Structure formats: C-alpha cells, structure tokens
Amino acid sequence: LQFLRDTVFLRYRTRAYRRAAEKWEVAEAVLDVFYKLLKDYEPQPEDFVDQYVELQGEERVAFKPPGFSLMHHLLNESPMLELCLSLMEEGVTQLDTYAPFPGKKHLEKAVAYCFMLLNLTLQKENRFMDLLRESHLSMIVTPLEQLLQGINPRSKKADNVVNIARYLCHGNSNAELAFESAKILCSISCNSKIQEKIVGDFTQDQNVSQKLMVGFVSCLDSEEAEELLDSEKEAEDQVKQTNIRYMTKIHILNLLITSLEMKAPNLAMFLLGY
Amino acid sequence: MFVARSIAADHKDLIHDVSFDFHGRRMATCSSDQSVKVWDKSENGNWHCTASWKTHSGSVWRVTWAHPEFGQVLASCSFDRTAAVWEEIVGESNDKLRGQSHWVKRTTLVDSRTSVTDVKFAPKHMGLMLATCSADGVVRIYEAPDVMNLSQWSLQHEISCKLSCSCISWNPSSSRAHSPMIAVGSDDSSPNIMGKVQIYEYNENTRKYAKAETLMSVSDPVHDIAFAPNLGRSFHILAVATKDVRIFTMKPLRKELSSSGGVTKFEIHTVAQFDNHNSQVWRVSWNITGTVLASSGDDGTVRLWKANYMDNWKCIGVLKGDGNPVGNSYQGF
Amino acid sequence: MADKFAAKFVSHKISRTRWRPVSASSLQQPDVFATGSWDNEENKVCVWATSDFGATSLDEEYQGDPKQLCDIKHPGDVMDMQFLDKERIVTGSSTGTVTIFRHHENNQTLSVNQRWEQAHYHVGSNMRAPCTAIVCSSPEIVSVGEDGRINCFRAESRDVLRTIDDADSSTMHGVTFLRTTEILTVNSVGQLKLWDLRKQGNDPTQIFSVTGERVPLHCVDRHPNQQHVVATGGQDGMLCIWDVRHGKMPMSLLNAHEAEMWEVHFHPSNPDHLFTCSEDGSLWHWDASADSEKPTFLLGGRSTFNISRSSIAPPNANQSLACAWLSTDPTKGQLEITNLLPSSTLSVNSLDVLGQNLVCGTDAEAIYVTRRLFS
Amino acid sequence: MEELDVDPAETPIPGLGQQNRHIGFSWGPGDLLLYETLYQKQGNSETAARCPFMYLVRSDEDIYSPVLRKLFNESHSIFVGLQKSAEEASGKSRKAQLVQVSRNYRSVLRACMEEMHTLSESTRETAQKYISQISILSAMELSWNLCEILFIESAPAGPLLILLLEWVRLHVCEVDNIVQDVLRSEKPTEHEKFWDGVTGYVLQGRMNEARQLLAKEASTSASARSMCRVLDDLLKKMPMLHTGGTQTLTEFELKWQHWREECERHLQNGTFSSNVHMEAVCRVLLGDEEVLLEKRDLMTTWYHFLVSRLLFKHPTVKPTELHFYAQSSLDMFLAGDSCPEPLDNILLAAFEFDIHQVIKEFSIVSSNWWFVAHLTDLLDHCQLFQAHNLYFGANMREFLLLDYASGLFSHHSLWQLGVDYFDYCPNLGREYLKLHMERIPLSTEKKALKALRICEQRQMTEQVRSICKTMAMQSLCNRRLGSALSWSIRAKDAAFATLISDRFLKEYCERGNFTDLDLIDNLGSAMLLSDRLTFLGKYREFHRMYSQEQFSEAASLLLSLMTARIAPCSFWLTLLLDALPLLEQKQVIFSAEQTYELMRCLEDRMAAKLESTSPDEIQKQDSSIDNTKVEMLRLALARNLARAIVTEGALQE
C-alpha cells in the first residue's frame, strides 16, 4: 500500500517522458487500481474497534483496515485530492487543445475514473461519518464541500467548481463527461449554504460568464436534436447519448428544484437569465 | 574568585617558572626538583601530571615554549652552563589514533662555560633564531636553517654587552622599514655606572647589531627588562624592574636620511616611575596586546598598570599574596 | 544570469554527498568525496573525484566532471553519512546499523572497520529502524533515531557505549550543534529540543513549542554567520530563527513559503544566503530580501520564466530606504526563493555548497554543478 | 572603559590571609593566571603535595552569568541593524528611526526584565544578584528614556510635558498597586487607600477616574457633594492643551491663568473649608509646595516632585531654567533628609547636558561599557554634539569597541561578535584577531575559514598566508601530508611544495610506484611554482606515455624535461633506464646529439655522485652486481645509440 501510493502515486508525475501519451496510460493504470480498492472496501462498525490486541495479555499493534485508513486519509487532506485536482486541470487544458492528440482518449478514461471514484467516495463518506459519530475513537474528518471551496494552492482561489464546469463546455461530443460532472455537482448540492459562493463564481467576469453560457448552450441545444439520433447509419451511439443527456437534464432539474427549495439566492433565476 | 592555598605540586624544591602554550590548553612547571612537569588543562580543566622528565643539572630557572610553527619545541636553562632543547614528538599519524609520546632533546647549547642567565627564541619576522645570555656579559645567538632540520645549532651572532648579562628583551618588529632591537638590563651592582641597560639595533647595511642606546641614569642591578608589545604602536615603551618601577617612552623623532643606524634619534621620557611596591620589584609582565602591565616584588604583591586616553599610567590592580586584596575601584579626574 | 551549470548525465541516482575532510581549516573543494547511494545500481558507497574550481577545470565534458573511483555495497540506504576525520567514515543503514570505514584513496578501497549492529528500533513489533541523525565531532559520536533513543559513543567501539532511553521520546527530524557539546533538534510535533552532552536523563532534556503555528519542523541548521543562532523549517512554510545556548528566542518568523520546508542548507561564501531542497517537487535558492528590484532569485531558473539582475542604489543625499530586518515584530514576508528546472529534474537528494561553488546529485540520474552562484 | 586609568581595582584573594606564600603568574586570555611560586616567599618552608588547584582571576566574571549572552547578542543584532542603516536615511526619517530603535532597545531590556523575574521568583539564593541587576537595568531604562526625550526629538514644550508624563506613568507602578488594593478590600470609598489612590490620580492626571472616585466620595458624604462638583469643574478646566498646536501659546496661557485664578478664588472663598483631603487637593491644584514637601514621603521620587512643580506652575518651559528648577527641586527634597546619592546628580548632569560626565558617573558606579557603547553609537548618529566631548580628547568609540570585543573573546564562540566589532576598528582589530587566534586553541574548519573570508574581502593576504602555512604545517605535524599539500596550494608556496614533492619522490624511491596521481595530474597550469612536484608530475606523464607506448610524445617530453635540467642524478638513472626501449625502437625523431648531452651530463653526474659518496657502501654478492650492471647500462647506451645512428643514416638515403 505505502509502496504503491508513495513510490508510484506520489512519483508517477515526477517522471520523464519522450512521448506525452505515456502519462495518460500510467495515470489510468494507477487510478483504476484505487477505484477497485474503493469499490471493494465496504466499511463496518467494528472497523473502529481496537488497535492493540492482547496476544496473551500483550497489547500488540494490528493496523486498521486499509480501507479505513485510505478513507480517513482522503477525509482529511490527502495528496490524492491534489493529484485529482491536477488531473482535472490537464483535462481542461487538453480539451482546450481541440487539435487531436494521441492520448486524449486515455484522458477521458482517466478523468472518468476520477468522476466515478469520487462518486463512491461521496456515497460512502456519509456512512463513514455515521459510524464515526458513536465511536469513542478520536478520528478527524473534514466534509468535502469544504474541500470544494478550499483555496487551490496553485491559483490561490476556490475554482474547484469552475474546473468542474469547464468540462460542460468541452462536452460537445462528451455527454458522459457532462453527465458525471453534473451528477457530482448535484450530489454535492444535496446540502445547503453554497449559492452565495456559486454566485460569486459566476460573477467573476463577463467573458467568464460568456464562455459559461457558450458551454450551457452546447449542453442544452441538443436535448433531442443532433441530426443523427434518428440515423441508423450511426446507429446505437446517437440514441445512447440521447439517453445520457436525458438523465443529465433529469439530474439538472433535480438540482434546480433543490436550489429553489432554499431561499434567495437560487441559481435557477441566474441560469434562466434573471 | 579563587581562594588561595599554600598547598603546592609534588616538586620537593623551589618551583622556578611555569610556561603556557602560545596556542592554549598546555602548561608546564620548571623547578629545582630537576624534573620538568608538563600539565595539560583538560576539557574539564583538570590539569594532571601528564609528563615529567629530567632536563638539566642545577636549578632549572626558566622554560620557554615556542609556537608550533617552530615545532612543538621548548628551551630551558639551568645551572649546567648550557641550554637544553626539547620538542615533544609522538608516534603514528593523528587521524583518530593517539600513539605514544616522547621528549626530544633537539640540542643543548653549551654556551662556552657560562651560566645561561636568560634564553628565548627569536621573533617571527626576523627568521628563526634564538638568544642566550650569561653572566659573562656575552650573548650567543644560534641558528637552525631548515624546517625539518631542528637539532643543529650554530652561533649566528654574538653581542658583547659589557657587564654580566641578566635580563634580555627582544624588540617587536614587523616592518621591512623597521629593524630588530634588543634591550639588556644588567644586574651587576655599580652606582658609578649609568646606562646599566644597553640597547642594540640591526643596521642592515652593516648587517650587524650596533649599540643603539643606554639608560644613562641606571645604576641599579636590573631585576627584569620588558619591552611593551609595540607593533602598531608607532614608537616603543620599556618597563624596567628593580627596587622601583621605570617606564620609558621612545619615539622616533629623527630617523636620519643618510646616516641611519648606529644610533637613531629617539625621544626617551621617564613616562613613569613608581616605588608603590615599597620593595624591590622583581618582574613586570605584559599583556599580549601591549596595553597592561603586572608588577611583583618581595612583598608578594602585584600592581597592575595601564595607560589612559592621555596614555598616562595608573595602577588598576593591587593583588596580595601576603594578604587579601580589597574589591573594585574606579575614578576619573 | 548566474554562472550556468555543468550537468553530467551520470545515469545514477544520488542520496548522500559529503566532502572528504582534511579538518583544520581550508577553502578548496575536496576533490575527493564519498557518495552514499539513493539507488545507483545497488545501495553502495562510491568514491568520486571532482576537478575543483573553474581554474584548471573547464574540461572533461563542459566545466569539469566528477569521476567514479571505486565503491563497496551497503545494506540499508545511506540516509546520512558524516566523516569523523580525514579518512574515517560513518554512515547510517536503513538496516539500523552504524557503519564506519577507513578509506584508502591510494588503494581506491574502503575498509570495513566498525559496526554497531544494533540501533534504534520499534517496540511492540520487534522491528528494526534506521537512524535519523548522526553527529560527528571527533572523536565523540551521537546517534538519534525515529524511536527517540540517544546513542552516545566514543570512536572505535562495536558495542553501545551508552543509549539514553526515556519515559518520553518522539520522532526526530533535524539536529545541529549549538556549542561544542550542546545539541538541538527540530521534531515532528513542532518541537524544539535541547540537550547537553555531559548531562542527560529520562524524558527529553529540554522541550519547547510556542505560538506561531507550531508545525513539524524537518530541517535545522546553524547559520553560516553564527552557530548559536539557528534556523528551522517545517510544514507551514514559515522559517523560524532562534538564539540559544540554554534558552530559545526568535530572531525572525519569515513568511518565506506556504508549505513544508523539507531540507535547508547554508551558503558559506554568503553567510546570509540559503538553499532549500524539497521532494514536494522543487528546489530553491533563498536570498536576502524580496522584490525583483534586486537580482531576482525568486523566479530565477526554470529554463524559461527567468528573471534576475535588477539593481538601484540611493546616494544617501536626499534619498531614504528601509527594509524588513529593521523591523523586530515577528511574521515577516517572503525572502526570495527561486525554484530551478533546467529541462527536467527528479528528486535531488544531496547537494553541497562551498564558497560560491555548488555540486548536487539527484534522482534526475545526473549531477549539476556551478562555479558561481551569482553574477 | 573610556577612562582608562583608575584607582587600582584590586581583586580579593581570601587565601594567603592566614596561609600566605609568594605568588607566580602567567596571563590568561581575558583572565589572569595566578599560582603559588617559591621565591621571596611570604609564607614559610617548602611544600610538595601535588596540588592541582588553579587561580583563575576573572575580570570576565560576567561571562558566567546566564542572561548577559542574550543581553549582548541581541544588542549586537539591533546594533548592526543600526549601523547597516547608518549609511542610509535622512533627516526626518533618520530621527524617526532613531526613536524607533530607542523603543526597540527599551523593549528588549524590558524582556530581559520579565524573564529575569521568571528566574528570580524561582531562585531563593541567586535572587539577590538578580535584584542587583534588575536595579541597574531599570536605571538604564529610566536614564535612556530621559536622554532620548531630552535630546533626540528636541521637541518644544507641550509634547515635552506629554512625553514626560508618559515617562513618569511608565516608570511609576505604585498607583496600580493601590488600585488593586482598593478594588480588593471593600468599597473604594470605604478603602483606607481611597484618598491615597485619589492623590495618585491627581498626580497622574487621570481626572476621569479621579472624578469616578469623587462620585463615590460625594455619594458617601452629603456635605462634600458640592465640594466634589467644584473640584470636578476644576478637573474639566485643567490643561490638556487648552489651545491646539496651530494656536499660540498666548491663548493656552490665558486659559491656564483663568483656571488658576478661579482655583485661588474658590480657595479663598472658604468653599473648601470642611474637607481636609479636598482642600489639600486645592493647594495641590494651585501648586502649593507645602503639600508637595509633606507628601515627599509618599513621593520617594523627587523627579516626580519637579514634574509636579513644572506642570502645576510652569506649563511653558525654558532649557536654561530647567536647570534652575532642578536645583530648586533637589534642594527642597534634600531639605527633608540629605543623604549621598549618585543618580540624582547624574540626571542633573543630564539636564545640564554634560553627557560625558554622566557617563563618568555610570562608569564609576559600574563596569559595563556596553550601555555606554550604545550611548556612543547614538551620539555618533546625532550629527554633531558638544558637552565637552571626550572624543576630541579621547576615542570613546574604539575604547568601548575593544573592551567589548575583549570580553567577547572569553568564550570559544562568543569572540565572534568581537570579530564583528573589529569590523569597525580594524587598523588594530584584524591584527589583534590574528593575535588572539594564534594564542587560542583551534580546530574548526568553518569558523577559521570564515575569518579568512572576512580577511580577503578586505584584501589582507599577509596574515592570510601566515595562518594558512601555519595550520598546514600543523596538519602535517599530525602526519597529514595531504592537507599540507592542498594548503600549500592555498598559500602558493613553491618551497614547501617542492619539499613535500620530494617526500613523494622518496616514497617512489621506497615503492617504485604512483599513488593519488590524478590528484596532482588535475592541477594544470598551477604546477609552475613547485618545480619538484612539476618534475614528479612530468615523470608521471612520461611514465604513462610509456604505459600506452606513446613513443613520439614520450620521447619529446623526456627531452624537454632533461633540457630543463632538474632533479637528482640517482633518479635520472631510472629515467634513462626506462628510456631504453624507446631508444631501441626504430624512430627518426631521435636526435643523437641531444641524446648525448643527456649522456655527457650523465657522466658529469656520475662523477659528482662518486665524488660525493660511494655508490655501494654495502659489501654483498649483489653490490658488485649492481655496479657492473651500471657500467653495462652505459655500455648499452653507447651501443644502442650507435645502432640508432646507423638506422638514421640508412634512412637519410
């Protein structure tokens, strides 16, 4: 564990590459592994019970579940957070490079593992905190929305959500990527006290909001209109992506209803143009 | 604040001098016990009898150490008509190993047939010589040519200094435009004789010492003689020890233009004269910076004299070995 | 510009570089130097030679070269390796073994003299541990480790002369002389600890932590302008400077960064310039003051994005200027660290500065050197 | 010190007061090395008991107190900041930074004070010397405030009164103690120190809370309520800059006199004729000196006496009359009970400006030239001053600099600041540095080397080379020829370099081989100094041109080297012994005539060798073998040269 995380997951970025494509597939080879770890590890209440065990009255160290540990590390500041961030910025960057590259493919795969891994992180952190609350063991965890507004220490600004949104513009043929971005957005939105920060993020700049509206127009102008969904020449791909952005707007509207369930501000007036 | 004992080292006889390292931590006692005892101030400071070996015959009056660039070498004088020379050589290569040490007589200057009244090495700037004086009125001046060639000693020069030699003194010199000089205080008794202290210079074109001066004034057997350390000091001062205390300032007023040497024009003032010891004053000891002088006499007291911003001189310490001195003191006008 | 570097692609990883000593005091670069492996081919100690100084050396690649001489292989990484005297070598093993050679420069070999096979270790698991810091003032030897023991030895012994154990010990980061027989460390708690070589006991001899964002301090060293004032670096990014021989107090809390100071080391020819190396992914030269108005060693290097060499001087007639040192209230600003990346570099694990000369070996599989640190 | 000749400051020896003996001496570095010696003995009889005690008389006993290190080091820090600033700044800015550094130094001494406490309440035996040092350092704080305020800003009246009242409130701590006691015991008006605190408030000019207690008094007594109201009006009208800084002093003096006259009016009305405390307050408010001299006992502070005089009567001040007021206040205070005191006269001489005699008073009271040194630096920065300056009759700066550095040398690391302060008296400082350096034990690469650095940036190579050769030869004294070597390369000494080169060559005589060859091979053009090492390295060169059989350039180098005509003959033996097979090989560059000055010099050298010594002093079966081998060698030389001539001629065809 320490081997792979330190020797590789800390060091993979530190490598020299004659061809850039190598970084993509290396990162995928590491991300997928962490995903199986998360996916497999299912917590239990007894995960919190004891570290020294009396082997014949001898309290011996018996290290916690690797799951337990990997969560709690993620649950507090982890370099995993930072490298996830990185992944996101280079994803945005390569997408801004609309000239095709050998490795963009590995990029969407890698960032996809990012989305879905973090999704499971969310679906399990709830129960983890839940078990923690009764526990007499002193563990520290920070809820992740706080991370989402944390000051990114390369830009010195909380553009986590902005980086999330940057992929909506890029999803001109990436209904998946738009989908995972938005579903994570609403999964976060499941709680309160963020519309203020969201409004500030929107209100940085006119040109920021202009590229934003370009992206939202890209997301919305095809909710059944791609000129290929009825074509059997392209076949299953078009109808499948129609399904995809169908669920996207599903959860878009779920999020909007939740936002209006709270008082002003509510970002739907914004998004409608108000 | 160290209280005084009368308890002394295991020397069954009078202890003559103690000499300290010109680089620190090391000391040695010379006595009439004939055994030279090298003590070493430990890191805790505890100095123990680290060495003790015989060196001479008769009362070994004086041990003089030399800077390790001289080698870790020493001179010693005693009632043997001669002067002994010991360097401590050790075995092996000192990296993290310390082998066995051993005392080495590099030489012993027979000094004709005359008792070595004083003896000490030569200053840095003039090459590496050494001077011996005897009650013969004759001063022998010996030489070692090369760095590994220590044991050999040739009388490079001799200066005949009229009355029997007692106490000698090297002039500090560090300028090529400056010259080496020697002052000689005589312990012969003649009220008739003025200038009982004689002063010689090296006139370089003559390649030789001439008589620079005498103290036509002195008819008292000189106990000891002591130049003040003067190398940035643009003139010189002399401390002279007998029943009283003589302090003289010697300023180059005329340095000649075509007749330098033989004698050069100096103003000499008796810038101080004191009987405050109220007894015969044996030795005066300078601070190495040449700013402080200690003085002792038969009463076992030491008086401590300095110069002010008029350069005049006051006793700033009075230390009793027959009693218990008083505390602090300060004053202005 | 600042005297560009000679880079020799050594095809080797570097962990520890330490000058071959001749003790006493002299200015030259020790042409001879012993090297502890990060992973060269194995973990080993090699002997290497450097054509000292731009004088009589501008050749053998471009601006000199270090050359392999011999080597002998070593269990446990060489995290630290210091020299007792001219040719007696003491290194720590990751196997928790204290290893002492006598080098043979003429035979080009290393002699396996003395081994304390026993060192710092974990309790409740019965597992061995490497040593955190070795202390060599000939011939007294001190060892300190993760578990917190104290290992006091006279030179030349294969059995422990003493190991001070405590009812209170911790993880230790960096050590420095305060005096000849006084010692300080910075710890992983934000802890400044003191001891005297002669007097010790149970639980740390002296313990300190105060307001000012105590963070795990990783590196400590005694200033190239004075020893009893020392500097420490830790997690928060702020450098903490202190004056001691029995009591601590801050010269400065310089807001010199925002993140961990892994290792800091001191400029000889400039008792007031610094260097920092960090496996956060960067390596900075630290300079007095700030601003680009003085030659910028804040953004200097990085191949591109280069900036330095700006100057202006008041004649002191009707002109006034003030700077940060003239303020004694704590929490000062940044003080000019520049990260440098030639075309690409990996974890630099050993570096040395002598005068304005610098050597450094790395995980970038090469060596980087400069004759001059400025221009 | 500054005055460098004083009454002998004798150092007590409690020994030899009952058990005397004659004394012997040697000088310590900053201490004094006394022992017993046997000549002109004070005592009686011999003694031989192996006595290992020492006599270390210390004028540097200060080094053994724990706080002085912090004292002087942080003084050092602020000080060096001061000087490194002194080349910059101007006028108004300069004044501002002066005041700044003043406050900084006072705060530092304050910090010393609180930590000094922390020591004292812990200690039960050493607390008394802590008391002594706290007393002196408090004296320096108070005096330092007085001097700065009196001089630095050189401000006019008004702000002067403000700052002096701030001074007094800083240096007087009783009033808050009475505050705490009054709040501690019962109600403030029921407190026995009620009116005591009220008097303190009147003294401190804090009429707001003074009226707060006046309210308690008026509530308590229904007869003094109007009395308190009148006094409250007085406290409302009293001077807090009656007119602003853009006004004229005429208007402020008008308001002052209006307040004054109404206070006398109310007094003579008999309005305050039933409350002793408040009517005494009325005399105080009118500045009536009888009450002041009565309260002298509760005062204990005749400077407070004078400041009360000035405020209650002299809202405007004149420097010349300040001395007059001081005289009057001093006489009135001594009238209660005259007793000897330095500090009063010291601060007098402060008000009559004579900084130098003030310093003299300090120097007779104490022995710490430190505080005066900082006084001096301030006066240096003050851009000209004269109170009978003793810098035009003495040199206070370098005096205290050298005293200070001399104290610094006392510790094996604490001398370093002495270096930093010879950084400002070097015409004797650097030389005294080398002086003390050679005299003190030393090993340390880095501190020594840094002293070197310091030197060369000042371009002072002479002592440099002296020390380098000295410590190199100590290196070889430890049998370390390598450090000797590199360090001679540091000193640039062809003499010793050739010497140890010849030691190398004797090692080659011993072993026949090279070691650490490249360590010299890399030395490049620097080789030109040591000719013996130059020859040895060129022998290496020819040796390996042999080992890879580099005939042409090998022979050319050998020719050049021998034309250079360097090294002893016994080795040119082996030289041409190795030159043999080249001479054998068919080569046209062979210049037989040059080979023959080689051989004729060989004849010359073998003749000289025979004259100087016998080739073989050992009689053995192999000595004649070696000899006849030598003759055979030269015979081989002749025959091979003959063959080479044959080949050359056959090729000249």
Short mmCIF file of all heavy atoms in Angstrom, two decimals, chain B residues 3-4 320-325, chain D residues 13-21:
data_model
loop_
_atom_site.label_atom_id
_atom_site.label_comp_id
_atom_site.label_asym_id
_atom_site.label_seq_id
_atom_site.Cartn_x
_atom_site.Cartn_y
_atom_site.Cartn_z
N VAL B 3 40.03 31.16 45.95
CA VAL B 3 40.73 31.28 47.22
C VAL B 3 42.08 30.58 47.11
O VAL B 3 42.24 29.62 46.35
CB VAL B 3 39.87 30.70 48.36
CG1 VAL B 3 39.47 29.27 48.04
CG2 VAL B 3 40.58 30.80 49.71
N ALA B 4 43.06 31.07 47.86
CA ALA B 4 44.44 30.62 47.71
C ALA B 4 44.80 29.56 48.74
O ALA B 4 44.51 29.72 49.93
CB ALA B 4 45.40 31.79 47.80
N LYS B 320 47.39 40.86 46.54
CA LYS B 320 48.28 40.48 47.62
C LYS B 320 48.40 38.97 47.76
O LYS B 320 47.40 38.24 47.80
CB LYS B 320 47.82 41.10 48.95
CG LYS B 320 48.38 42.49 49.19
CD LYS B 320 47.81 43.49 48.19
CE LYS B 320 46.35 43.69 48.44
NZ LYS B 320 45.71 44.59 47.46
N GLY B 321 49.64 38.50 47.81
CA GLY B 321 49.94 37.12 48.10
C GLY B 321 50.38 36.93 49.53
O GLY B 321 50.51 35.80 50.01
N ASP B 322 50.62 38.04 50.23
CA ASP B 322 50.79 38.02 51.68
C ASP B 322 49.52 38.39 52.42
O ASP B 322 49.53 38.38 53.66
CB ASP B 322 51.92 38.97 52.11
CG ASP B 322 51.84 40.33 51.45
OD1 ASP B 322 50.96 40.52 50.57
OD2 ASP B 322 52.64 41.21 51.81
N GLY B 323 48.44 38.70 51.72
CA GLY B 323 47.19 39.09 52.35
C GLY B 323 45.99 38.87 51.47
O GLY B 323 45.99 37.99 50.59
N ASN B 324 44.94 39.65 51.69
CA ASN B 324 43.69 39.53 50.95
C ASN B 324 43.35 40.88 50.33
O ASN B 324 42.97 41.81 51.07
CB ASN B 324 42.57 39.05 51.87
CG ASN B 324 42.92 37.77 52.60
OD1 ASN B 324 43.71 36.95 52.12
ND2 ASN B 324 42.34 37.58 53.78
N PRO B 325 43.48 41.06 49.02
CA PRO B 325 43.20 42.37 48.42
C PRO B 325 41.75 42.80 48.55
O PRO B 325 40.85 41.98 48.80
CB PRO B 325 43.59 42.18 46.94
CG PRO B 325 43.92 40.76 46.78
CD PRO B 325 44.19 40.16 48.10
N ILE D 13 41.84 38.06 47.14
CA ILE D 13 42.19 36.66 47.36
C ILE D 13 42.02 36.36 48.84
O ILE D 13 42.89 36.73 49.64
CB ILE D 13 43.62 36.33 46.90
CG1 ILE D 13 43.78 36.50 45.39
CG2 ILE D 13 44.00 34.92 47.31
CD1 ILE D 13 44.21 37.85 44.99
N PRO D 14 40.94 35.70 49.24
CA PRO D 14 40.77 35.36 50.66
C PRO D 14 41.86 34.44 51.19
O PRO D 14 42.17 34.48 52.39
CB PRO D 14 39.40 34.69 50.71
CG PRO D 14 39.20 34.15 49.33
CD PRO D 14 39.88 35.11 48.40
N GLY D 15 42.46 33.61 50.34
CA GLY D 15 43.61 32.83 50.71
C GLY D 15 44.83 33.71 50.92
O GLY D 15 44.87 34.88 50.53
N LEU D 16 45.83 33.12 51.57
CA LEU D 16 47.07 33.81 51.90
C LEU D 16 46.82 35.00 52.82
O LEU D 16 47.60 35.95 52.87
CB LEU D 16 47.83 34.25 50.65
CG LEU D 16 47.91 33.23 49.51
CD1 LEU D 16 48.64 33.79 48.31
CD2 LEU D 16 48.54 31.92 49.96
N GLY D 17 45.71 34.96 53.55
CA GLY D 17 45.48 35.92 54.61
C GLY D 17 45.86 35.31 55.94
O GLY D 17 46.00 36.01 56.95
N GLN D 18 46.04 33.99 55.93
CA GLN D 18 46.41 33.24 57.12
C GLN D 18 47.46 32.20 56.76
O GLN D 18 48.13 31.65 57.64
CB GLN D 18 45.17 32.56 57.71
CG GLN D 18 44.68 31.36 56.89
CD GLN D 18 43.98 31.76 55.60
OE1 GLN D 18 44.05 32.90 55.16
NE2 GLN D 18 43.30 30.79 54.99
N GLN D 19 47.59 31.94 55.47
CA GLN D 19 48.38 30.83 54.96
C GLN D 19 49.20 31.26 53.74
O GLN D 19 49.30 30.54 52.75
CB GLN D 19 47.44 29.64 54.70
CG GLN D 19 46.28 29.89 53.73
CD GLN D 19 46.62 29.66 52.28
OE1 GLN D 19 47.46 28.83 51.95
NE2 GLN D 19 45.96 30.39 51.40
N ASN D 20 49.83 32.42 53.85
CA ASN D 20 50.44 33.13 52.73
C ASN D 20 51.60 32.36 52.11
O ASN D 20 52.13 31.40 52.68
CB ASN D 20 50.92 34.51 53.18
CG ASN D 20 51.79 34.45 54.42
OD1 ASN D 20 52.14 33.37 54.89
ND2 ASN D 20 52.15 35.61 54.95
N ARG D 21 51.98 32.82 50.92
CA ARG D 21 53.14 32.34 50.17
C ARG D 21 53.33 33.27 48.99
O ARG D 21 52.41 34.01 48.61
CB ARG D 21 52.97 30.88 49.72
CG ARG D 21 54.26 30.22 49.26
CD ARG D 21 55.37 30.42 50.29
NE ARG D 21 55.02 29.87 51.59
CZ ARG D 21 55.06 28.58 51.89
NH1 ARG D 21 55.45 27.67 51.01
NH2 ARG D 21 54.69 28.18 53.10
#
